[PDB]
Write a protein that binds this ligand. Sequence first.
Ligand SMILES: C#CCCCn1c(Cc2cc(OC)c(OC)c(OC)c2Cl)nc2c(N)nc(F)nc21
Length: 208
Amino acid sequence: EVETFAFQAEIAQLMSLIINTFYSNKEIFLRELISNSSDALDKIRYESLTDPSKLDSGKELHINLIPNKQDRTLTIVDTGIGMTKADLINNLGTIAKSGTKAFMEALQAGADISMIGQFGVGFYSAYLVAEKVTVITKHNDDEQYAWESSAGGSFTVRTDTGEPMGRGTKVILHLKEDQTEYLEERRIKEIVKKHSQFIGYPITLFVE
Ligand SMILES: C#CCCCn1c(Cc2cc(OC)c(OC)c(OC)c2Cl)nc2c(N)nc(F)nc21
């Protein structure tokens, strides 16, 4: 049972700009996703202080980076707060509208794509390297969901019947044919060291 949705006009515009603009410094997508993972882990850690039962779906707070050359995927996994169906379909897109407009205007005023995170829309930098993005997420109050988009103005949401993840988010980057350098161990290590060296959670780079 797959539900198909149209992105709000501003988000479809942002995704097109990210796909179409010539911009060589694509590596910045990784810092954006790791930073989102880190914010999600802070959120579950904060909530657990007043309600300890929120860690019943997993005590460990961490980030895994999983490359897979056979599937041509790079997966960012976290055991953070996770997302609800409402976040996936409408809540995040609503907040994204404001950030998208501010980012588009900043670009016209002379800013570059690396500043995307300051506008709360850093997640869409995934499309600098990915032809398709799959998001598997599980929030304590909701079910496990799979969000997916190859851009083109639409995204899908389905109940994920795959392997339960307990609590957290998995961002699966189906890389563009010319972006396989992001499956290489030394390339991932270099980017993490350059942009994500001060994240307060363990980041484990899996090897193939
Ligand atoms: C913006 C923003 C941050 C909030 C949404 N979000 C994101 C980025 C994100 C933003 C989105 O819109 C702006 C969004 O679209 C609905 C999205 O889902 C595909 C994600 Cl993953 N990553 C995580 C994560 N790792 N864990 C949790 F829990 N929430 C996340």
